Symmetry: C3
Subunit: 207 residues, 3 copies
């Protein structure tokens, strides 16, 4: 009888003013938009749409605007305070987790690094492939028997697409490859948010 | 297999010493009573009784003694720190939510205001109908696919009964109208707590 | 479809670096061991093993290294800040709770006290039997319809074994009596953690 709940570990694309935990996380989508976007309600987000329309509950949305998977941010800055690998332990007690990241690592120019599936050092976690592997490894152990789905944004560099896809395959994690997402200011529009939700449902109907 | 969990967004009637989140919320019911009441145990509360007896789990009880639904309190004081519309975002991750409020808005003499179903300003949420509507609107979005039930106390002014009932109907929220609840010092007694719990079951059953 | 979640209220034996809530709790098991033990991963702990292998989810692990059930610690120190009866209210919203304590009360030499099933004072809760009853009483009310299991460590003094067993019987709580748990530095080894997990599965099947 009890419906499965979903948490989100995301970035700008999964933020919405007043729905972020911790509440100090940076927001991209406001009720009264700050940037030029047509999205003005949480009901229009990809995650609220998917959760509400597929009979799920909302658990924790730990999304942070401009966050990278790894600890190298924009202009080589240290993003250890806001990275996905730092925030992965605060997602409540969900039944399903969506990971929606890697866009910022792609556009920040974070070093891609080498594939590393164990013995991660502090130096390694400043590069992408070791941080992506460390994320999935630690989350599989932290969230036993929780369904984990990686959402891969459309329009990223192929080196990030292939890295995300290879590391997800290593850990047997489903990687949902988003395509043709309609964007405004490089972020999903109302149409784009609907396309993300319908593409997740397509992937669930196939899998 | 996994049993549904319940959270409460209440006021004096749903408080019990040591069961409130955040733990800094004002309590009405203490283990050793400080008010004239016969209730001395959490096992006697309407919410513990309903949850335990109908095979549910307890999630979060966010109840605050004397808290109003809107931001106008007793003697026209600003209750923005304790109102239901301020505390509605901290109820854990439940399967069911009970909202049990409007008694303090009724006895504080909070301005009733006009019905407003969008564009709520800071000024509007100091009045009852806009705050009621803002509460249900925001909670439906914050708690998708969570069963929400408004519990309406017995003995309130008809302007508050009718406002609560009209705003619940707008948002398609069940409003359980409590009747003849036995009280001591204006708060449910052991009998009253049992009557609240039995009246919720009969609403569920029908 | 939604799987039951489990929370742990433990001591040294249920700790693991990075899996404790609150994160300020004392840890015994580190990734790189500080004490002489062969355990180096959360995957080897009795609780992660049981949860992962019996198709459950992890809720909250509130374990504190060296914490006592009652408020008297080692060398008659006041353990009111870290006792089980102080920490019992912060276990999330689980479907099942494991209580794994009393080892420290046994080796600290905490006063055993008299059996007391009501009217507990601050003075009473410095002794074992009143604190152990206060723990089960308050947790049954705080966690309605949650399955509660007391795990009793092997090799403790019989006065503690018999007290725990009598107080669990009073409150109709299952007391899982662990036997022959393989230990290193007085704490479960990899073998010991597997024996705890298999003995919980065995108890669950016969009850």
């Amino acid at each position: 009888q009890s419906l499965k709940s979903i948490s989100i570990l995301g970035d700008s694309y999964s933020t919405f003013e007043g729905y972020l935990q911790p509440d100090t996380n940076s927001i991209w989508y406001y009720v009264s938009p700050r940037q030029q976007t047509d999205v003005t309600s949480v009901k229009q987000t990809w995650w609220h749409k998917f959760i509400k329309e597929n009979n799920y509950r909302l658990c924790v949305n730990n999304s942070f605007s401009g966050a990278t998977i790894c600890n190298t941010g924009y202009n080589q800055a240290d993003y250890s305070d806001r990275s996905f690998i730092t925030r992965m332990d605060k997602l409540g007690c969900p039944d399903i987790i969506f990971i929606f990241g890697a866009t910022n690592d792609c556009w920040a120019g974070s070093p891609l690094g080498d594939y590393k599936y164990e013995g991660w050092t502090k130096e390694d976690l400043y590069t992408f492939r070791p941080a992506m592997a460390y994320l999935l490894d630690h989350m599989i152990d932290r969230y036993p028997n929780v369904e984990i789905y990686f959402l891969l944004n459309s329009g990223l560099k192929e080196e990030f697409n292939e890295s995300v896809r290879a590391i997800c395959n290593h850990y047997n994690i489903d990687c949902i490859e988003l395509h043709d997402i309609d964007k405004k200011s490089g972020h999903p529009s109302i149409k784009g948010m609907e396309q993300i939700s319908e593409q997740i449902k397509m992937f669930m109907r196939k899998t």
